[PDB]
Structure formats: structure tokens, C-alpha cells
Amino acid sequence: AGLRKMAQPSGVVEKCIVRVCYGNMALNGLWLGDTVMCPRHVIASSTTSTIDYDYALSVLRLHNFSISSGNVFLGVVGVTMRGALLQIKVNQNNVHTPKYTYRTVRPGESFNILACYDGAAAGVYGVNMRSNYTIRGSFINGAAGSPGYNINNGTVEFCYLHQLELGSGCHVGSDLDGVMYGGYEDQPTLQVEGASSLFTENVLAFLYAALINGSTWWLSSSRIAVDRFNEWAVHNGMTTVVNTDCFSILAAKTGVDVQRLLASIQSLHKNFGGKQILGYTSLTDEFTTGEVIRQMYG
């Protein structure tokens, strides 16, 4: 019983964290095989005016780097630019490189953040990619380079490297190909996060977990067709429901179908009327159907 936003065990990823320093800048990097990936702003001589990263790279001095894993320092063989990342070839292989892949995450998908400072993991927490391509995370200065990951059958799937925090205090990274999520810029310019919508399918997963845990006071006796709901959602800051195949086992488990839940969502979106649902006083879209099923059943 219970529902917690949890992370997968971080040990496999902790051994891949390095500190990357250049001049006045210090952040974290990801050491896989003989390569270090880190945000390319570590070589910026400003962060207050618009950086020409190509220029900065061209005038760079390889010896001005300081890359370390604990006490182990790494010699830099070469640097190439990889979107918003530097791809740093180092003189040593990381013997603790896990089996890994890269995958870009989509809005609505969950993953794990390993928050790092000075090349060492400080914390680990689960996040969910928002519709405007940000995450509601917790980061202060020095956190850039912090990796996002999912672990699936022993393989570490890397999906995020932290880059910046917007004016609203929400967070933006790039994937491991160096493509920024949401097309935000790694510049100190004035960027505003876009509009953001509740992932309805995630909210459904949450309500199913609420039923499985014996929360039922909010459950509607009315139904509403997906068609009809979708008309309402787009005026009320929620996404349209596309696929309902992912609710088969949960509806089988609970005897409650998607249509009753969509009706409940309409009531609850307005207000929780003074009450709580698994400790929440408003609807969350931080849980996927996958997390819920795995957490309720294994």
C-alpha cells in the first residue's frame, strides 16, 4: 500500500559522475567509456551576455580543464561540440561504465534526477516531463550536468543533463544528443516557459492508485465519454485523452472504468472541497500508468 514518487536506486549512475572545471566555471559531467559529457556553458566567459560558443571553443586551452572523479584526475585528449553539450575525450576509461543507452523523453514521461554538486551525487528524486518541456525540480548553482536517467533491465537509459533554470524557477536540460528540451536556449537571455497542461492520463493513473489504496469518497457515479471530456479539457488546462489501452489492468483491478474517472476529474479540478486524496489537495499528473502499476503490483 501507499503511493510515493520514488526514484530507482542511483548506485549504477553515481559511479559515472565527474566534476568538470574551466576557469571560473565548475559543474558536473557524465563519464561513460572514455568520454565526458557536460553542458557547454562551462566554457562560457560570461553568463550575462550572449555567448558565441564556437568562438569560446576555438580559443579554448585543453590544459585549462580540470576533470576529476573523486581524487582521480582525467587528462583531456580532445573536445568536440555536441549541440548544447561538450563531448570530451579523456585519457581513461571508466571501468564502472554501466550498460547504457540514450533516449529522449517525451512530455508526460517520468524519469530520475541525480542532483550533483562538485562532481558528486547529493540527492535523487523522480520527476515528470511537463507539457512545456520543463521539470519542477530542485537545483541551485553548481547543479548543471546533473543527469536524468531511467533503469530498465540492467540497462541505464540516460535522458537528461541539467542546463538551466528559467525565471519562474523551473528547470531545463538537454538530452544526451545535446538537443535542448523545448528548444530553450543555453543563453542568459529572457526566456519565458510556455503554457503548461495537466497530463490527464497521468491524473487517471493517480486516481486509480487512490482507489487501490482505498480512497473512494471522490468517485463519481456519473460517466462522461472521452470525446465529451476532451472538449472540456482543452478549456480547462488539461490534455486530451488519446489512449485508454494503458488503463486495462487498472480498471480490471478496481472495477472502475476511465469514464467515471473523467467525471471525477471534472469535479476535482474545481476543488477538493477541503479534503485530501493520498495527501494531495489538488490533482497531480506526476505519476504515469507505468509507475502506478509497478508500485501497486510489481
Partner: peptide, 8 residues
């Protein structure tokens, strides 16, 4: 304004 989160 966006804050690029490297440290000193």
C-alpha cells in the same frame, strides 16, 4: 532571465 547553473 534564464540562469545557467554552473557554479564558481
Amino acid at each position: 532571465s534564464a540562469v545557467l547553473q554552473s557554479g564558481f
